[PDB]
């Protein structure tokens with residue numbers, strides 16, 4: 001689809017079998033989701049944003065479907081203010097900025 | 100143009116007579132720029148992201164040029180680690196997400 005930006009670009013995603021709402025976030029290198037339960041191994045990591053750094057759990061090679069488009073990549077889980085889909089997955093679904 | 104997301108979507112902007120680099124950021128409601136001494140009145144504001152909140156100064160009706168596309172709107176100035184162009188200005192230059 002073509003998505004305008006008068007509203008937040010929120011979309012439904014599927015991860016671990018469960019549906020969620022997430023923000024398409026071209027300013028995020030990485031995908032960060034709010035606290036949730038995910039199967040498989042993970043490693044502790046740090047990520048920094050506008051206000052400082054937080055502790056996250058890094059899940060690699062996770063299946064996630066974004067607005068009907070499949071991706072498999074890294075998903076960080078931790079105290080982000082909102083679920084964000086970052087460039088690591090936006091590239092996988094073929095997302096570009098256009099003006 | 101069309102901007103892929105393999106790397107950060109950085110572009111040149113012109114604001115307050117200065118050229119700078121800024122992110123085209125669909126996850127940013129507002130536009131936040133590095134500390135710069137703009138003239139005129141302002142109001143304090145707090146904006147939150149990963150890591151918490153930062154204090155910024157809100158200037159209204161600021162002229163910004165983004166890749167030759169002119170816009171005018173609110174700009175927040177503060178100790179942000181990165182300049183981000185938010186949706187308030189991305190809509191004005193006709194920017195969409197597409198996949």
Ligand SMILES: CCC(CC)CN(C[C@@H](O)[C@H](Cc1ccccc1)NC(=O)O[C@H]1CO[C@H]2OCC[C@H]21)S(=O)(=O)c1ccc2c(c1)OCO2
Nearest residue numbers: 027028029030048049050126127128129146147148149181
């Ligand atoms: C609430 C949704 C986002 C937080 C997730 C909000 N951010 C915009 C993001 O695009 C920032 C924009 C950003 C980009 C680099 C550095 C600081 C901020 N990116 C970000 O935080 O990404 C992190 C996850 O991937 C990593 O790659 C970059 C940092 C990491 S933000 O910078 O904090 C921001 C910008 C304008 C705003 C605002 C919050 O409140 C209203 O106006």
